[PDB]
Design a protein around this ligand. Sequence first.
Ligand code: NDP
Ligand code: 06U
Length: 157
Amino acid sequence: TLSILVAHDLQRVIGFENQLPWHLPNDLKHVKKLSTGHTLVMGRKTFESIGKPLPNRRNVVLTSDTSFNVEGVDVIHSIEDIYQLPGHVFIFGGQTLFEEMIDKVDDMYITVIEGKFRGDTFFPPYTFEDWEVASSVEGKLDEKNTIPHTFLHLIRK
Ligand SMILES: NC(=O)C1=CN([C@@H]2O[C@H](COP(=O)(O)OP(=O)(O)OC[C@H]3O[C@@H](n4cnc5c(N)ncnc54)[C@H](OP(=O)(O)O)[C@@H]3O)[C@@H](O)[C@H]2O)C=CC1
Ligand SMILES: CCc1nc(N)nc(N)c1C#C[C@H](C)c1cc(OC)cc(-c2ccncc2)c1
């Protein structure tokens, strides 16, 4: 199973100066729930921005750097190596990789942040004509989660 796992805002911003533009603990829990025990694939820049691999799942990084090695991180150098990955596989970031992968994945787990942030990294444009809405659940606003947001699970038609 090959999925996209992304959070973007109303204009598809997913990042600004190596950072997430927004602090939203509920989306982290959401990420932890979906991807624990499975596989996360990410481009080199996405990985360096986190700075450490995420616990209790396989971390795969795509890069052309043949010297790249990080403890707890499996390296690939080919888009094509993604399809040899066993199990449920999540394309985690960033803009470059989503652009390469958005026409290949079976489905997408999108967190829509109902805001307009300044960004420099964008999720590629997509139309609902090509995606069925399997589920749409609003996140709950509270003390620590202060931005309206929505979990979408879109499946390709
Ligand atoms: N929400 C998110 O997912 C987050 C992402 N970001 C950002 O993403 C921003 C924009 O950079 P972006 O390009 O999107 O980052 P990516 O995560 O897509 O990393 C890009 C790199 O991935 C590797 N790569 C991609 N495709 C291939 C391929 N076909 N073959 C071999 N290697 C490949 C290359 O690494 P290499 O150059 O080493 O060969 C490439 O330079 C960065 O500024 C980073 O901060 C920031 C915050 C959050
Ligand atoms: C959650 C945000 C998020 N949500 C969803 N639904 N999908 C995603 N792909 C990402 C994402 C992301 C990027 C890789 C990112 C950048 C970052 O820049 C500092 C820190 C983290 C991060 C720090 C701590 N634990 C998990 C992830 C993730």
